Design a protein around this nucleic acid. Structure first.
Lengths: 265, 199, 213, 148
RNA sequence: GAUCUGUGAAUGGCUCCUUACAUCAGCAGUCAUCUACGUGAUAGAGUGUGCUCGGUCCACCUGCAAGGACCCCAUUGGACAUCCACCAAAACCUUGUGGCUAAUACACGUUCGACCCAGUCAGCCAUGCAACACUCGGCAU
RNA sequence: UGGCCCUGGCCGCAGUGCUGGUGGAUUUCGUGCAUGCGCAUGCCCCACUUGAUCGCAAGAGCUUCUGACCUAUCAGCUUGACUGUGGUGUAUCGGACCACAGUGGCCUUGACGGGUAACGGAGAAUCAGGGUUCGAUUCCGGAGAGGGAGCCUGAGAGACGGCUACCACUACCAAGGUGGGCAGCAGGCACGCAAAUUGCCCCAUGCAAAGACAGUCUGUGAGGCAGCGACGAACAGUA
RNA sequence: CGGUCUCCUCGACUAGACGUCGCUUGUCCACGGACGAAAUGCAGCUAAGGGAAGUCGGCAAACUGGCCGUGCACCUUUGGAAGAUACGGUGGCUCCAGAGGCCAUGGCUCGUGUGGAACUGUUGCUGUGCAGGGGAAUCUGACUGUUUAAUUGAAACCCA
């Protein structure tokens, strides 16, 4: 007897959720929704652990089934819905409006945003196919289909969809010079413009990115995410560090200075 | 039951493999259909498969859709008899329908069809429409027209027995569809039939 | 030998005992589910015809119809079949149970009979009393079937009620069933809503494809 | 040589209909005598042999003239021997580094690899072979290049 | 409460007997595949021939090439449960029978959910070389 | 694109109908709005849910490459064995199976066999360096459910708190019959040098379901909390 | 009913000069007849259940039995043991393969010689005659050969 497993142990949980190893044996196993299980936040983690409205699992169920947590412009009552990257999470009764993004350390933060920023979303095209009756579609990273895209919208591009209508509002090409964000690997959560794409037919192409200041890093082409035509026009608001990763000595000094100046009072 | 795994099959060296599990269901097999050619009724048993899907064991098929590739015709044509099989003659003897077996089929369609389409009578039988005359003569005057000397010598006997090859897998889709042999494959299998008629 | 004899026309069932072998032994090749005469095992049951619909035996095993033997046979049995019970067999399991064949013999403790033809006089347990049907038809079409209704007037008035008198501490209850398969203007508007929204969505998709072209 | 096959069946190419009335010049090759032949160009930096393109042999399990797709590892070996029909033994002598003793071992691995009839090869020639679907019990690699 | 139906019981928990390229680890492939829950889209079945032919009502002659009058759309059927009653058995998380009574069970049914276009059949028009081919019509080549 | 033929015959190509479904709300006229003057046009409930398709997601199966202990008082091993063609079967590739052909395949770079102080790994103990030894045990993978084997249902099982049979033990009996499966949690007998309570509870962590919470007790020996516990750790007292 | 020299030697089954039956040749001659034909006997057979308990002693009889395929242990003088022990099959019919020759790749001759398959039968086929039971030790003579015609065939004699 074996089928699909239903549980996720607390130790086997994705580390980018700062799950405490002693606070329970199990962690909420994400459902098979839009986002991948290791690139997603369950709505229970967004509601109980980050925005501590729910003091526990029961109150998380309560909050969510009361049908006032809206994710990507529609209500999601599943306590395990896999909210992922670039999703918009609104709580109207509270006036909360977040876009779930990556910090420079590679964790999912909830970046507070405003009106137009909540009324659209930004999603990367991953596949481009044709369905029956000659219907060209483009599957994105949110798993959505977009059943009739512009013909000149090749694969690795990004798209600005309006979460009300669910159609495409804009799209941004993946050519060199575009502003870009990393969504996996060690360099995840870092923003840098595209410099060059090394091709590796049969395997993963590599992308070299120049950070906002002057740093340089590399990652994979299925690991990059386009946000903006250039470093002047980001197609979305961006967090405090604007995707500029600090050195570890810089981060240590920053933490030390913060703790000291806070203890000052 | 019937298992299609290789934990019993010895190593490529020649060394024995010690099994330390028992047969999983995802690697089962089911008994062959051994579809028999049967004059009359069709038997098809549905089979519940790995995802709740259907297979269709054909037991006792009688005919099927046979295509005239050059002609794009595909008539349902009532298989007469298994004549040749690639390797084993036991299936020819017991009239087992398996994919890629060579059969004699009725072929009175593709003859009545040839008439209806081209207005050409292939055997001396043994209102008329202006548009029909026009269209038949047009399809005659088209470019690639012409019946080959191996197909018309078959369509010209009063009891057509045309050589088709079975293309479907009857034990899997419950069908005995196929295609009429044309040109060099026809010559090949006609030569085999000649050889075993004379030897 | 005990006979559970049931009169369906009256709607009742009554047990009887017979221990006279001269009467019993005529039931020794009477295979299950075949009518026979009541005059053979009782003289106050003449003109009655009993269909031998079921049976048990000593040790209590059932009498499975169609087995064509008079001894016990163990068989794989699905649920709900005569011999096994649907609410005991885990959603698809078959159990090997012991059951007697349909051929009657002197190993039968109980015979379940039902009258098909009534007789001259009247049986003191079965036919002297008629038993009313508990419930009336609950679905609209069956109510119509009953009361000769055509679709121009409603069944909501013709629905049968059940009057429980004003017993202790409680007034008279007139219990009626929620009519099923009934079509209300509300239901009609609901289905119209569904169909209209579906057609509007089809039009949306056609317009999308035409605009792309 | 191995172009020869059995005479129990009429070996035809899958995607070429030999009795077409008005066929197109899509598979009329630029060096053939009008003979139509379905072929493909496996695309990991390999060249389709002219023998495959302009040949007459029929071979399923051939990576150039059949549905067999080359995907997965691509290894380099030496043809030990050719004593099966269209299958060939290939050896990879490599060196495995033992950590404790800071030295290397001589190790090897054999492979029943599938040579199409498009390749001229002598025993001992070097071969690059790419992984395909399982073609037999031990054969899961096709020969993509023969190097003299 | 019960019951039928749906869905879960294939996860979890335990143990380490087996197992020596086997298991397993990392890497990779499925262009050789399956998929309930989840999610994003989708969805126009009177439909075996152009018609006779979705069903009835008339026509003509081994059917027709332009011929009609209505009908369908306020939504189907038959069961078996819970229940009542008689109960077999020493029991059994064993079981029979009779009578009602439900459906998102089961069976069954589908017009208006299309429109147009392709295509298929048939007819007609304008104009043109031509006495070649195959024929319909009259005779045993 | 073809897969109806000349009045019966043949097919019947199996399937797919956003339910002949449910709840809440409520004003359903075809012209109500209006435009231009009723005439013509755009509108005139919201959800839930059975099912079909395409992706995605989450899984699984299969497959690739490299990497495991001792043993030669194991040197030759293999005959579906190794390749091929045509089929079968499968969810799918495949000698997985079959029919016909061939004579291959592995091996001192240790094949085949034997041994288990062999489940594997993450890891543990030491460790200047190099290394040595261990890893039943919490996380991942595998296997099993007394030994075997066969199945049904289902998306998923060769399931065992499912069924069927045989074997080994075994329980009830009114002797005709009915049963069993703790390597789940407690607990008992054995075996031993050697290992705990027949506890309470879903409060936390999760999972499942037709299911937020309450009116009106979802379940959960998973899990938690207690009891026993000088295994083993940390901090104090005995002045 | 003993013995006695040589020659010829047909057909079918079969390995056959075995064994069984038949054409050619020869013969019906052995003292007969009745009576179902006692007891006893000499011969042929069977026998339930048991299986050497019979007897000095498995004596006598029984089991096995031909061929094909797979396969075979201790011990050994390396030759054997060995047909070890053992396991499976065997008919009839209808086919499929399979070897050669002559005239000139066709006509004709052409495997009673083999393998496979399907069907078939009250599981039965070396169907009759014929036709090893097997294994494990001790004493003894190495072996093969010889022997008291007419009570002893041996461990005796001979041999290398």
């Amino acid at each position: 007897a074996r089928g699909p497993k239903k549980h996720l142990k607390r130790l086997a949980a994705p580390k980018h959720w700062m799950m405490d190893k002693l606070g329970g044996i199990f962690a909420p196993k994400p459902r098979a929704g839009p986002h991948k299980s290791q690139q997603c936040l369950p709505l229970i983690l967004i509601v109980r652990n980050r925005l501590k409205y729910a003091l526990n699992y029961r109150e998380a169920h309560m909050i969510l089934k009361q049908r006032y947590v809206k994710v990507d412009g529609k209500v999601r009552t599943d306590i395990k819905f896999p909210a992922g990257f670039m999703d918009v999470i609104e709580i109207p009764k509270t006036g909360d409006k977040f876009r779930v993004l990556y910090d420079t350390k590679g964790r999912f933060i909830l970046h507070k945003i405003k009106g137009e920023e909540v009324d659209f979303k930004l999603c990367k095209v991953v596949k481009k196919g044709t369905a029956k009756k000659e219907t060209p579609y483009v599957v994105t990273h949110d798993g959505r289909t977009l059943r009739f895209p512009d013909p000149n919208l090749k694969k690795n591009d990004t798209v600005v969809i309006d979460l009300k209508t669910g159609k495409i509002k804009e799209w941004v090409r993946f050519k060199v010079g575009c502003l870009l964000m990393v969504t996996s690997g060690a360099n995840t959560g870092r923003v840098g413009e595209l410099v060059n794409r090394e091709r590796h037919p049969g395997s993963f192409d590599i992308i070299h990115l120049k950070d906002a200041a002057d740093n340089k890093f590399a990652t994979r082409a299925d690991n990059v995410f386009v946000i903006g035509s250039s470093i002047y026009h980001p197609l979305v608001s961006l967090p405090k560090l604007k995707g500029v990763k600090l050195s570890i000595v810089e981060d240590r000094e920053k933490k030390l200075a913060h703790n000291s100046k806070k203890q000052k009072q | 039951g019937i298992t299609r795994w290789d934990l019993h099959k010895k190593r490529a060296t020649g060394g024995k493999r010690h099994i330390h599990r028992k047969k999983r269901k995802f690697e089962l097999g089911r008994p062959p259909a051994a579809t028999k050619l049967v004059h009359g009724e069709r038997r098809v048993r549905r089979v519940r498969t790995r995802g709740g899907n259907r297979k269709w064991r054909a037991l006792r098929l009688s005919g099927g859709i046979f295509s005239w590739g050059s002609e794009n015709t595909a008539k349902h044509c009532r298989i007469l008899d298994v004549v040749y099989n690639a390797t084993n003659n036991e299936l020819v003897r017991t009239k087992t329908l398996v994919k890629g077996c060579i059969v004699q089929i009725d072929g009175t369609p593709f003859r009545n069809w040839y008439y209806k389409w081209y207005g050409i009578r292939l055997c001396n039988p043994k209102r008329v429409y202006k548009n029909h005359l026009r269209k038949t003569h047009l399809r005659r005057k088209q470019k690639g027209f012409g019946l080959e000397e191996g197909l018309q010598a078959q369509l010209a006997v009063p009891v057509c027995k045309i050589l088709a090859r079975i293309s479907s897998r009857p034990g899997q889709d419950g069908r005995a569809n196929g295609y009429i042999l044309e040109g060099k494959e026809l010559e090949f299998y006609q030569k085999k039939l000649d050889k075993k008629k004379h030897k | 030998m005990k006979f559970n004899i049931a009169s369906p026309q009256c709607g009742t069932i009554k047990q009887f005992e017979i221990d006279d072998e001269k009467k019993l032994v005529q039931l020794n090749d009477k295979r299950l589910a075949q009518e026979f005469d009541g005059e053979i095992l009782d003289d106050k049951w003449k003109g009655y015809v009993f269909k031998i619909v079921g049976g048990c035996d000593k040790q209590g095993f059932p009498m499975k119809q169609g087995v064509l033997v008079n001894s016990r046979v163990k068989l794989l049995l699905k649920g709900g079949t005569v011999g096994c019970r649907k609410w005991r067999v885990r959603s698809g399991e078959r159990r090997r149970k012991t059951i007697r064949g349909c051929i009657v013999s002197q190993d039968i403790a109980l015979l379940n009979l039902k009258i098909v033809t009534e007789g001259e006089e009247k049986i003191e347990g079965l036919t002297d009393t008629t038993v009313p049907r508990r419930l009336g038809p609950k679905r609209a079409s069956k109510i119509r079937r009953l009361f000769n209704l055509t679709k121009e007037d409603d069944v909501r008035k013709f629905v049968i009620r059940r009057e429980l008198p004003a017993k202790d501490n409680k007034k008279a209850r007139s219990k009626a069933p929620k009519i099923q398969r009934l079509i209300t203007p509300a239901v009609i508007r609901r289905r119209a809503n569904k169909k209209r929204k579906i057609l509007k969505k089809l039009a949306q998709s056609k317009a999308e494809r035409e605009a792309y072209n | 040589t191995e172009v020869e096959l059995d005479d129990n069946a009429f070996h035809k190419q899958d995607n070429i209909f030999l009795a077409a009335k008005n066929p197109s010049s899509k598979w009329v090759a630029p060096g053939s005598k009008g003979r139509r032949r379905w072929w493909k160009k496996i695309g990991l930096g390999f060249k389709t042999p002219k023998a495959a393109i302009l040949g007459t042999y029929i071979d399923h399990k051939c990576p150039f003239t059949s549905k067999v797709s080359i995907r997965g590892r691509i290894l380099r070996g030496i043809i030990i021997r050719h004593k099966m029909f269209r299958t060939v033994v290939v050896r990879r002598n490599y060196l495995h580094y033992q950590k404790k003793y800071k030295r290397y071992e001589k190790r090897h691995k054999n492979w029943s690899v599938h040579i199409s009839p498009a390749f001229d090869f002598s025993i001992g020639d070097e071969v690059v072979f790419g992984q395909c679907r399982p073609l037999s019990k031990t054969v899961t690699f096709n020969v993509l290049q023969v190097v003299p």
